[PDB]
Specification:
seven-stranded antiparallel beta sheet, Thrombin, subunit H, binds calcium ion, 13 strands, mainly beta, binds the ligand N=C(N)c1cccc(-c2nocc2C(=O)Nc2ccc(-c3ccccc3S(N)(=O)=O)cc2)c1, six-stranded antiparallel barrel, 2 domains, 2 helices, globular
Amino acid sequence: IVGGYTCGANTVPYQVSLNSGYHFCGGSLINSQWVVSAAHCYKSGIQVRLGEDNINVVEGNEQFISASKSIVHPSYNSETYNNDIMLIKLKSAASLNSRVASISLPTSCASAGTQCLISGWGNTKSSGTSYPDVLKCLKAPILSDSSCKSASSFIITSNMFCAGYLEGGKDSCQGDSGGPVVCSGKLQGIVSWGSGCAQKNKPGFYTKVCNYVSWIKQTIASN
Ligand SMILES: N=C(N)c1cccc(-c2nocc2C(=O)Nc2ccc(-c3ccccc3S(N)(=O)=O)cc2)c1
Ligand SMILES: [Ca+2]
């Protein structure tokens, strides 16, 4: 997260870090045994870390649980980025409290101009690089489809939406992926991609969770 702020210890209790020996992607907890993330974040043998703040220091409210299974969406196309969503099942349920809590799926898609909360432990730097210890946060507006389409030369599909600021400066970044975009207390987005980070006329792009609510529920129920 570039141009953002330190969220505060456990203020975003649905934020989850996916760890493969090190932090590498975030997710969102949708219920006590299911985490939503990005399909491009798939890795075998993931450990999912709940109640994290400082990912480098053991602070007392962490829960480390192993991914039972990681279910990439069937039409995820690693090359085009379309359907960049995945569900991770945990081997055991997380124990839910004030610092570990699930986020609601949307009932309808969020409208352009909605202010949302984006968070993660990804790059915070303007130009050059730096990864924070504690969780970063960003409030950013969903931009319009016609604004997003003109903003890129990669092919945008109807399973993506863009959010952030056209002037650059404020954006999700590398290591944020798979993390949440929450709008009006609903999980509307998954950090998916962007052309660099916080660059002018290059806003962040997000999996449009609202198109996948049925697939999520059916998947959770079948497994
Ligand atoms: N700016 C962001 N919000 C953001 C978020 C996560 C990662 C990165 C990022 N930080 O550094 C690079 C990044 C990146 O995503 N590069 C990138 C650009 C385009 C695509 C892509 C998009 C649509 C279609 C096809 C492609 S692809 N696979 O052909 O390149 C994939 C990755 C930036
Ligand atoms: Ca910690």
